[PDB]
Design a protein around this motif. Structure first.
Motif, PDB file in Angstrom:
ATOM      1  N   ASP A  94       0.780  -1.163   0.005  1.00  0.00           N
ATOM      2  CA  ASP A  94       0.054  -0.071  -0.101  1.00  0.00           C
ATOM      3  C   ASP A  94       0.869   1.105  -0.113  1.00  0.00           C
ATOM      4  O   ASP A  94       2.049   1.205   0.151  1.00  0.00           O
ATOM      5  N   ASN A  95       0.239   2.583   0.075  1.00  0.00           N
ATOM      6  CA  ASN A  95       0.928   3.664  -0.066  1.00  0.00           C
ATOM      7  C   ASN A  95       0.876   4.516   1.421  1.00  0.00           C
ATOM      8  O   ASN A  95       1.074   5.653   1.164  1.00  0.00           O
ATOM      9  N   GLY A  96       0.551   3.595   2.304  1.00  0.00           N
ATOM     10  CA  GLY A  96       0.719   4.262   3.598  1.00  0.00           C
ATOM     11  C   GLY A  96      -0.752   5.174   3.983  1.00  0.00           C
ATOM     12  O   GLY A  96      -1.510   5.298   3.239  1.00  0.00           O
ATOM     13  N   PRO A  97      -0.876   5.649   5.253  1.00  0.00           N
ATOM     14  CA  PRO A  97      -1.967   6.267   5.625  1.00  0.00           C
ATOM     15  C   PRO A  97      -2.260   7.475   5.305  1.00  0.00           C
ATOM     16  O   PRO A  97      -2.892   8.328   5.380  1.00  0.00           O
ATOM     17  N   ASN A  98      -1.148   8.311   4.681  1.00  0.00           N
ATOM     18  CA  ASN A  98      -1.378   9.505   4.083  1.00  0.00           C
ATOM     19  C   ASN A  98      -0.787   9.616   2.428  1.00  0.00           C
ATOM     20  O   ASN A  98      -0.249  10.493   1.987  1.00  0.00           O
ATOM     21  N   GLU A  99      -1.568   8.700   1.776  1.00  0.00           N
ATOM     22  CA  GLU A  99      -1.202   8.360   0.529  1.00  0.00           C
ATOM     23  C   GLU A  99      -1.657   9.896  -0.350  1.00  0.00           C
ATOM     24  O   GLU A  99      -0.851   9.957  -1.240  1.00  0.00           O
ATOM     25  N   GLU A 100      -2.587  10.521  -0.065  1.00  0.00           N
ATOM     26  CA  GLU A 100      -3.043  11.556  -1.170  1.00  0.00           C
ATOM     27  C   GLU A 100      -1.981  12.542  -0.877  1.00  0.00           C
ATOM     28  O   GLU A 100      -1.597  13.283  -1.887  1.00  0.00           O
ATOM     29  N   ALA A 101      -1.516  12.933   0.359  1.00  0.00           N
ATOM     30  CA  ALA A 101      -0.809  14.127   0.446  1.00  0.00           C
ATOM     31  C   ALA A 101       0.657  13.949   0.017  1.00  0.00           C
ATOM     32  O   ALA A 101       1.380  14.475  -0.247  1.00  0.00           O
ATOM     33  N   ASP A 102       0.821  12.437   0.420  1.00  0.00           N
ATOM     34  CA  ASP A 102       2.354  12.113  -0.104  1.00  0.00           C
ATOM     35  C   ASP A 102       2.405  11.946  -1.713  1.00  0.00           C
ATOM     36  O   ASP A 102       3.459  12.308  -2.127  1.00  0.00           O
ATOM     37  N   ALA A 103       1.414  11.606  -2.213  1.00  0.00           N
ATOM     38  CA  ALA A 103       1.231  11.521  -3.626  1.00  0.00           C
ATOM     39  C   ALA A 103       1.438  13.042  -4.532  1.00  0.00           C
ATOM     40  O   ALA A 103       2.135  13.103  -5.328  1.00  0.00           O
ATOM     41  N   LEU A 104       0.831  13.751  -3.935  1.00  0.00           N
ATOM     42  CA  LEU A 104       0.863  15.339  -4.208  1.00  0.00           C
ATOM     43  C   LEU A 104       2.162  15.721  -4.034  1.00  0.00           C
ATOM     44  O   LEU A 104       2.582  16.811  -4.492  1.00  0.00           O
ATOM     45  N   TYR A 105       2.887  15.644  -3.010  1.00  0.00           N
ATOM     46  CA  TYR A 105       4.334  15.904  -2.854  1.00  0.00           C
ATOM     47  C   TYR A 105       5.238  15.496  -3.915  1.00  0.00           C
ATOM     48  O   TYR A 105       5.783  16.234  -4.387  1.00  0.00           O
ATOM     49  N   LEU A 106       5.014  14.129  -4.132  1.00  0.00           N
ATOM     50  CA  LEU A 106       5.965  13.630  -5.122  1.00  0.00           C
ATOM     51  C   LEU A 106       5.742  14.216  -6.361  1.00  0.00           C
ATOM     52  O   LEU A 106       6.645  14.597  -7.070  1.00  0.00           O
ATOM     53  N   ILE A 107       4.475  14.332  -6.807  1.00  0.00           N
ATOM     54  CA  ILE A 107       4.001  14.780  -8.161  1.00  0.00           C
ATOM     55  C   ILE A 107       4.438  16.445  -8.356  1.00  0.00           C
ATOM     56  O   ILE A 107       5.051  16.562  -9.394  1.00  0.00           O
ATOM     57  N   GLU A 108       4.344  17.367  -7.315  1.00  0.00           N
ATOM     58  CA  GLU A 108       4.939  18.415  -7.397  1.00  0.00           C
ATOM     59  C   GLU A 108       6.277  18.613  -7.758  1.00  0.00           C
ATOM     60  O   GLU A 108       6.587  19.383  -8.522  1.00  0.00           O
ATOM     61  N   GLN A 109       7.011  17.661  -6.961  1.00  0.00           N
ATOM     62  CA  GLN A 109       8.403  17.538  -7.269  1.00  0.00           C
ATOM     63  C   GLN A 109       8.685  17.089  -8.773  1.00  0.00           C
ATOM     64  O   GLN A 109       9.745  17.943  -9.264  1.00  0.00           O
TER      65      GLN A 109
END
Ligand SMILES: Cc1cc2nc3c(=O)[nH]c(=O)nc-3n(C[C@H](O)[C@H](O)[C@H](O)COP(=O)(O)O)c2cc1C
Length: 362
Positions: free
Chosen positions: A242-257
């Motif tokens: 899985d992508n962890g319990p903070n998947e949406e906020a963690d996804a938006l960080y990586l995508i922004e980078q």
């Protein structure tokens, strides 16, 4: 007719929006993990795709987790891929190579010296990989217990990706797709469930994204941002990861980078085909605000879902997987509203021409 219009993807221009997703078929020669002329015919038959994303390909011998999957680290692999790419380009196709390190999704018998595979942490993947039995056919076996990567080894992983990117350019590929999804090494570092490191490659999201962003930066310096694509699966569970319990906020960080670096494209593997609730329009808008280049959606897609999302500007292209396996002229079939060939799933993995190059066109 928006699906059939051209699209600039990095340094090339795809003839349409109907892309071919990466599809592991496990038909490479062993030993050597060498692409074959059969694979060349397979990809040549599907050159009508706007962009062909090759099957996942090993950046190194350590990166091998699937028996029969190809590599692009040895000279004979480079020479074989060069014949495959030249054939697709002759039919006005465009092709990218998906570079992966399987990480903990691997078996010791496929590793150099028969040793344990590597991973960010010594945690079992809890799933299976594909080996080859005595007959040479694909068989599913539980993955080996991995070894935690030492901090000293991480620059070697980045250099393996960099060299594979240089190898991809020599082999004539148009683009590179970093495989940062589906529970493989780059995704293992991203996920808090699989990454329990306490150095600068674990813990915070910037630490968990450090390795993949070091690979992107190394690819930019090696070839250029307009040649580097990346595939992510940052929402949901894939291969028991899985992508962890903070998947949406963690996804938006990586995508922004990734968006700040202006890379070629962002290829998102969505949770639909993996058995999960689809993206909301609100999440897709958050992705679009952070990533400006082309966005490729894949996973349980239809022409209607693709046309709606492209019309809303949430994605720019769609990648089909199983439909391309069975339909070498999928673009023509979708344009002419023709029926698709039935899929023969028993011949997806391993074997020869049957279920590979023997699907008929219209
Ligand atoms: C035989 C098969 C092989 C696949 N191999 C890969 C791969 O090598 N790398 C990857 O990122 N995804 C791989 N996938 C997942 C697909 O690329 C993609 O996410 C999915 O198939 C798209 O959904 P669709 O088949 O409904 O179009 C594979 C899927 C299948 C069915």
């Amino acid at each position: 007719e928006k699906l059939y219009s051209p699209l600039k993807v990095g340094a090339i221009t795809a003839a349409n929006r109907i892309f071919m997703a990466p599809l592991t078929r496990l038909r490479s020669i062993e030993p050597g993990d060498i692409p074959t002329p059969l694979m060349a015919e397979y990809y040549r038959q599907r050159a009508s795709a706007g962009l062909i994303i090759s099957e996942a390909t090993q950046i190194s011998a350590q990166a091998k987790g699937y028996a029969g999957a190809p590599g692009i680290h040895s000279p004979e692999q480079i020479a074989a891929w060069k014949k495959i790419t030249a054939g697709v380009h002759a039919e006005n196709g465009h092709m990218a190579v998906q570079l992966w390190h399987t990480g903990r999704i691997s078996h010791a018998s496929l590793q150099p010296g028969g040793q344990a595979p590597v991973a960010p942490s010594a945690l079992s993947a809890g799933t299976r990989t594909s080996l080859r039995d005595e007959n040479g056919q694909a068989i599913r076996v539980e993955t080996s217990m991995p070894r935690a990567l030492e901090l000293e080894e991480i620059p070697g992983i980045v250099n393996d990706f960099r060299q594979a990117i240089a190898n991809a350019r020599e082999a004539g590929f148009d683009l590179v797709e970093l495989h940062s999804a589906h529970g493989f090494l780059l995704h293992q570092f991203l996920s808090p469930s699989s990454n329990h490191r306490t150095d600068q490659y674990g813990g915070s999201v910037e630490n968990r994204a450090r390795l993949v962003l070091e690979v992107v930066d190394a690819g930019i310096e090696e070839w250029g941002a307009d040649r580097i694509g990346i595939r992510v699966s940052p929402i949901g569970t894939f291969q028991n990861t899985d992508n962890g319990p903070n998947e949406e906020a963690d996804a938006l960080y990586l995508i922004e980078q990734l968006g700040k670096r202006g890379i070629a494209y962002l290829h998102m593997s969505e949770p639909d085909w993996a058995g999960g609730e689809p993206y909301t329009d609100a999440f897709r808008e958050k992705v679009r605000a952070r990533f400006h280049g082309p966005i490729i959606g894949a996973g349980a897609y239809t022409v209607e879902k693709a046309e709606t999302l492209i019309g809303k500007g949430l994605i720019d292209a769609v990648a089909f997987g199983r439909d391309w396996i069975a339909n070498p002229d999928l673009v023509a079939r979708l344009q002419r509203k023709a029926e698709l060939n039935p899929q023969r799933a028993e011949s997806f993995y391993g074997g020869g021409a049957e279920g590979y190059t023997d699907y008929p066109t219209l």
